């Protein structure tokens, strides 16, 4: 019986000359510690094509842990031409 | 004369607590398909303010069908800072 799994996603806007990756993230700063969750994903977008799903947790962005990111960094990385994510998800049942 | 209607509900909270959405689910399996129903809605809670009703059927949570969710995923999803539901309800004035 398999629980969550972690996988690496890499997205490049150059694939289809897109201006966005087609997802959103909710960032909670509780106790001062931070977690990042996927809020929504566009079905036809680059993120969806690489397997990102609503409710996934983002453990790392560009090899940096979620708790090590701030608003400035987040906005910077998410707007760049390419993006790496370390994602924790539940397998599709 | 309208019967049931289906609509999307999106809810957001500022913490990671399991019970803060203000609703509970009941479950029934028929013909090898599990269905989820809203058991109770907290009168002043988040879900109520978004129009979730007791007796509503939950078709999907975070884009996953009700029959494709297990108890671990449920607890997780219900504790995240955002939640997406596809809901079937009867119109109310």
């Amino acid at each position: 019986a398999m629980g969550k799994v972690t996988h690496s996603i890499h997205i490049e806007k150059s694939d289809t000359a897109a201006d966005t990756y087609g997802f959103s993230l909710s960032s909670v700063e509780e106790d001062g510690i931070r977690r990042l969750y996927v809020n929504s994903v566009k079905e036809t977008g680059l993120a969806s094509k690489k397997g990102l799903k609503a409710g996934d947790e983002i453990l790392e962005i560009n090899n940096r842990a979620a708790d090590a990111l701030n608003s400035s960094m987040l906005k910077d990385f998410l707007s760049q031409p390419s993006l790496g994510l370390l994602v924790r998800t539940y397998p599709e049942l | 004369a309208m019967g049931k209607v289906t609509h999307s509900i999106h809810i957001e909270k500022s913490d990671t607590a399991a019970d803060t959405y203000g609703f509970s689910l009941s479950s029934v399996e028929e013909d090898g398909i599990r269905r989820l129903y809203v058991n109770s809605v907290k009168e002043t809670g988040l879900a109520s303010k978004k129009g979730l009703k007791a007796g509503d059927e939950i078709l999907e949570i975070n884009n996953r069908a009700a029959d494709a969710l297990n108890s671990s995923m449920l607890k997780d999803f219900l504790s995240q800072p955002s939640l997406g539901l596809l809901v079937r309800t009867y119109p109310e004035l």
Binding site: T20, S24, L25, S27, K75, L83 | -
Partner: peptide, 7 residues
């Protein structure tokens, strides 16, 4: 503390 980010 809660923020939303679009990408």
């Amino acid at each position: 503390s809660r923020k939303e980010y679009y990408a």
